[PDB]
Structures are given as structure tokens and as C-alpha cells.
Design a binder for these strands. Sequence first.
RNA 1: AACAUGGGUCAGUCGGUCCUGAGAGAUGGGCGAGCGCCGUUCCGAAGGGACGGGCGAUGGCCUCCGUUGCCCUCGGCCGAUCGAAAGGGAGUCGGGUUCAGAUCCCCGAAUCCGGAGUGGCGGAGAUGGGCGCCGCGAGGCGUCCAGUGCGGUAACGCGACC
RNA 2: CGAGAGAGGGGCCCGUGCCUUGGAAAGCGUCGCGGUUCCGGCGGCGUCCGGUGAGCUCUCGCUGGCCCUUGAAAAUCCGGG
RNA 3: CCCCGAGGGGCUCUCGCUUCUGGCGCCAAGCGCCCGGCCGCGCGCCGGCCGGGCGCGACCCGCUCCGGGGACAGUGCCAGGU
Lengths: 241, 49, 57, 119
Amino acid sequence: KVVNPLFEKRPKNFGIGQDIQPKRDLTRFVKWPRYIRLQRQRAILYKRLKVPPAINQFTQALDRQTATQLLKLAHKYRPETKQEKKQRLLARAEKKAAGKGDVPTKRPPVLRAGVNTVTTLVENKKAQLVVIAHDVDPIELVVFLPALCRKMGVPYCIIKGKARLGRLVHRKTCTTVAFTQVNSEDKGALAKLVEAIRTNYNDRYDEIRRHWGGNVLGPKSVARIAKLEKAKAKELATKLG
Amino acid sequence: DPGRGAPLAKVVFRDPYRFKKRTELFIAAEGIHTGQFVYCGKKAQLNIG
Amino acid sequence: VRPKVLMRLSKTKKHVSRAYGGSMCAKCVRDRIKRAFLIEEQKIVVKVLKAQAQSQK
Amino acid sequence: KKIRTSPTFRRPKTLRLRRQPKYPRKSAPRRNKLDHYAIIKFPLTTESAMKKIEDNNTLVFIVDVKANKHQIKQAVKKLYDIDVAKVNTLIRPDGEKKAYVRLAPDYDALDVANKIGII
RNA sequence: AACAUGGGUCAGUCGGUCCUGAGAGAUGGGCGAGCGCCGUUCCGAAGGGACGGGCGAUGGCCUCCGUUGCCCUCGGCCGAUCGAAAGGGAGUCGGGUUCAGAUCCCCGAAUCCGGAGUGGCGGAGAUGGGCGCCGCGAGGCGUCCAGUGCGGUAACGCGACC
RNA sequence: CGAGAGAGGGGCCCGUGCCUUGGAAAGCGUCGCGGUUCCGGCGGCGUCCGGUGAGCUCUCGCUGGCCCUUGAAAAUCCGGG
RNA sequence: CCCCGAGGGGCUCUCGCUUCUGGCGCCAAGCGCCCGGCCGCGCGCCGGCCGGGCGCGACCCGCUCCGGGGACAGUGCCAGGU
């Protein structure tokens, strides 16, 4: 990059037969392995057809910052994980001789994870907030759940990721969680988010259940029809009519 | 080409993605010879073979 | 010689002293090596001429 | 990065380990079933063998059918402490490997033979 | 040529093993109640390799060479395997010897490949050109600069010639 | 055969033929003497000079004829850019 | 072409512009941004000394590899005819 009387560009000119094309990052053409092809095809199918209403309800998930308030709320409420369970229980065994604590004693309100437990307390109407992971392997696991919450007026929300609900315990995933009651000092902070949630997921159950999805035609065919629509819009009124 | 009276033409093409040659065997159109340059593709205008 | 004998034959004995040779035949050694020039240099120069022609409409 | 140059997806090259067995699969070493005394079974004594001894300075042993020329050479040399010039064998139609062993030029076959016991 | 008792077949160089032919036949896949059958690149994440750079771990004498792990960088898997004592397949000949064995044993004279990565020896690389000074000379002192062969117009030669 | 005929002057490829190194000491044929048996015993003289050919058999090479047949593959080794 | 004042806007095709020759084409040039070690300073992203990265060169975006058919071939089970 200095002036040397001998440095010379040797410019290249690509183009057919001029000089062989150079290797460049291809990611559109490669023969992907079978399972990767499978994931691509399924993801594309779920748009290229129409999902039913009870499946399309699973795509209007929460706003990220709202979910962040929900989670920061939960992280003061997560249940007892490993190496905490053991230490608390051992200390409680030692408090037995001091008459101040055993296994039977008050536990402040905590989360309720499993689907069976969550549905039980929903149908007993002991739930004040329900969260739902949106990507669950067999969707029939919780396809019914929003309808149940609509039947019994229990606030419920559709969050992204089962992984987050997993992180909300020591486990790896949890289909749902639910607050039954919370510490009063946090009751108001709960209720504000509760109202924000129920404004969007409960009062419009009509449009949710009426909703349809997918049916979105691929960009190739979008352009292919755009050609003829442009042609007809452009040359309309062709006859003196 | 044994067992066929339509003799094959063996053609050397430069491979426009690497440094090598591909050698194909077409059905020799009548009247072509050794040492001809054969043009193949969308814009190669009318010539024999 | 038999192509397996070449593992012991002297280097010099297995090729002409010329460049781009020793993999030819007498007619190649002469006329192919001349042809590789009488074509090559003429063509590069004519490419220069026709490039000047493309610049001069 | 350098995420692609070829259209052919190729299996990654993972990291592979080596056996760290908890228990050795078997128990213990299996000793040699042939030390030197099984490679060298017994010498041979025939007229067409003492001719070899007194003319070609060569010994004629009989060895277990599975015994290399190298093995025969080393085992006889270790036994009789006698250096061997070369060894050639064969499989008699019986099934013993008769082994002709050309002693080294520095040794007297008629001396080492009557050392060993043969006539 | 029977019967009984003894003895005989020595290979780097002679063949097999090495490779592939017509074929044969495996796992991917498929069909099938099923032992299995179909199929040989077709529905497969098919390269366990490496010249080299960087880091680590070392052994000598970690002088500076040898070894290993790690990080890159490069590669068509362009199809496991078998299939030819007549095809392809580098390298041994002469004399002598036996109650039977010889391109094998003995004598003599050569060979091909692989080793020596501690270069074992010699030869080539390549040993100068210009300089100012003590010198008839010779070389010399210090400078600098070139040195990955030579010859013939040609075919190609000379002992090797990154 | 004007894409270089004849004409001279050269280069290479093969090279089993001939010279010599192997090498006469070996081999052979003859005359002889011992060990007289076992001897790869020891002494002599020799193994020389031409021709012939549509001969036969191998092998090497040039050039032709034939086909609506075109005449195996890889392992391997090598030359150049 | 509609426009011009010598600058150029609006509109259509365009293209990787590879054809006389039994050659030649790879493992990047150049430029731009970055900093690593040495000397002349110990103010050093100062000059001079050594050695490397990214970006451009090679544009961006994307839902199927690209084409060809297609809700018919076809397969599965029944049904008539041969």
C-alpha cells in the first residue's frame, strides 16, 4: 500500500468463461442432512397450510418486556431447588429439638408447575395467574387449557419458550406455571400485570377462537401472481370500455 | 461406440467452478471433426453441432 | 522400458533437456512446442488489439 | 466463521476417546506356549543329515509347524549359544517343520553336534 | 504300481499372497408373518487423512531436532469385500552335488524393494567478479556484489541439476 | 513430395548379434600317473578357419487388407505445467 | 425519447458484453479500516525497522435445491368384464 514501481493489480473479471468463479458462502443450496430438511419442511408447512383456531391461539404470545416483568416477579417465588432443599430440611431437623421448625410448617406461596396440578387448581378456581409455554411437543397437551381459563375466568398468558419455565425450577422444562396467591406486598404488582394479560387473552376469546392461521403463500408464488396482478392493474380499461 | 453405428464425440470442457476439465461424450452431429470448438448454452448462436 | 522399471532409472535418462518436454512425442517435442507459442503469443497480442478496438468505438 | 465453501454437507469430526477400562477384561498374562523348547523339539539323525553336518556345516532340527524362520533362528541360538548363518525350512508330508539351519562359518558342526548329543 | 521296514520335498529373485475382469456379495434404504430377500449409488451426516501456521505437553543436549494433545487450514464419500496358481504383477544366472530334492542345497558372479531421518563415506550444489593497498609474481588485507546446474542454432547430450 | 523431392551433414530408439569384464581356474573331448579304496585327485594336447540359404522355428520391425465386429480393466510406476 | 443550462432528472431493452486458431487460466491482486514486536523518544495509535485480522473487491432480502406434472397418475380394499 505504498508506491512501489512494481506492484500491479492483476484485476480479475468473472463472468462465464473469463475466469473461474470464486468460492463463496452458500447456505441456500447445500444438500442438508435428512433431519434438517425435516425441520425446514415442517416449519414451512405450518405456514403453508391453515392451522385450526385452537392451534392459532398459540401464536399471539406475550410482549417481551411484559414477560420480563412476569419473570422478574417469579424469580422471587421459584420453588426450592437442589442443595437448598437438603440444607433447609437438615436445618429444620435440627430446629425440631428447638421446637421452632419441622417439615410441617408454613411455606409462603410458591409456584405450581405440572399440568395436572395446574389444571386441577384451575378447575377448582384457586388460580390467580396461569402461564403457558407456547412450544409444547404434542400440542394436545395444552390445546384445551385456554378454553378452560375462559370458562372459569382465570387469567392466563402464552409465553415463549418452555426453557424459561424450566429455568423457573431446577428442571429443564415445565409446560405451565401458576400463581395461586402471592405475598400481599406484591399483590398489586401482580394485579397490574394480571390486568395487562387478561386485557388481551381473555376478553377477546371470541376473536381468538374465531381465528385462523397459516395459509400464507410462499414468496415465489407471491411474486408469480404479482406479475399478472401488475399486468391487469396496469393495462386495465384496455377496450374503449 | 461398439454396438452402435452413430459414433460418439468425446469433448473436453473447462469446469467453471474449479481447476479441472470434464470430458463428455455426445452423439456426433454429422460433419463435425476433431479440432472444432463446440458452443453449448442459451446464447450460442446457430452452428452445426 | 517397462513402466515399473522407472523407479531405478536415472532422472536425466527419462526426459529431454528442454522445458515443457519429456511428455511429448518427437512430433510433439518439436511441433507441439512450437504450436504452444505460435498460437499463444499471437492470441495474447490479438486480444490486446481487440481490447483497444473495444475501447475505440 | 467461514461457514461454507461446498454444497456437500459432511459429517462433523467429533472428539473420540480411549479405553479406560474399569476392570481389565481378562485376568492375567497368558504365558508363551512356546518358549524355546517348543520351537526346538528334537534334532534329526539320518545319513542324509550327517552328510549335511560333515559337508555343509549345517544342523537339521525339527520344529513345531508354527515357528517362523526368525523364531527358529533366535531360539536355537539362545539354546546352544550358537550363532546361525541362515535358516530354511519345509513341511514334511508328516506335518513337522523340518528346519535346516546353516551355522555361521566360525563354528564347527562336528563339534557342536557331539556337544548336543547326536552322532 | 503288491507286502514290510527305513528315507525324501530347503526359495527376497519359482508361484500364491498384490489388482481387477464377467460376476459375486455387505451395513444406509426398502419389502417381508419370518429364517431372511431386493438392491450396489440408488431414499444415506459415508473423508479417523495431511504439507504447513498458532497454543499446550514433553524426550535428548526439550541446543535445536524427535514425539504427543489442542486450535486452524486442505481434501470427491464420487463407494465395504471377494473374485485370474493361463490375464496385468518390480527382482537369478552358470557350474557342482544326491539311494530320491534343485533357477532352493554347495561354489561363483548379480540383482529388485525396503531400510540408515544419528547425512557413513566421497562427488554435485560451488565456490568467485569488481574493487584500493604489501607485492616481478603469487596471494594477501577490507569491501561489496552473483551464485536452486552446464553444451550444442536443432533433434538432444553431460554424472547427479531444489 | 512447395505442408519441402532427391541431395549432404546429424540425433535418437532397440540392441538377444560381436569384443571384453564373468573367464578357464569352470565345462567338454582325448593321451597319462598316482589316491590305487572315499577323491569336485593330479599331469598333458585340444575346444580351430571359412562358407550357405526363398530352408524350418522363434524373435524383432516396416507396411498393408478386413468389419453394420474396432479389439479388458484396475493395482502400480513415471513426464511435464 | 420527454427534457439541457454541457450538470443531469424522468422512460424501455440491456448485461456479467467468454467465437477466426486443437494454447492461457486454481490455491487473490489492489485498496480501506485495525492493531501485535524493534531501533532513533521513554510523550508514543511519531518516523523507521518485523509480522497479522477484518471489510471491499464478490451488493441486499427471502418459505421450500432447481426444474416438471398435480389433487390427477398411484397404492390399499371391494366391484363387473376378459
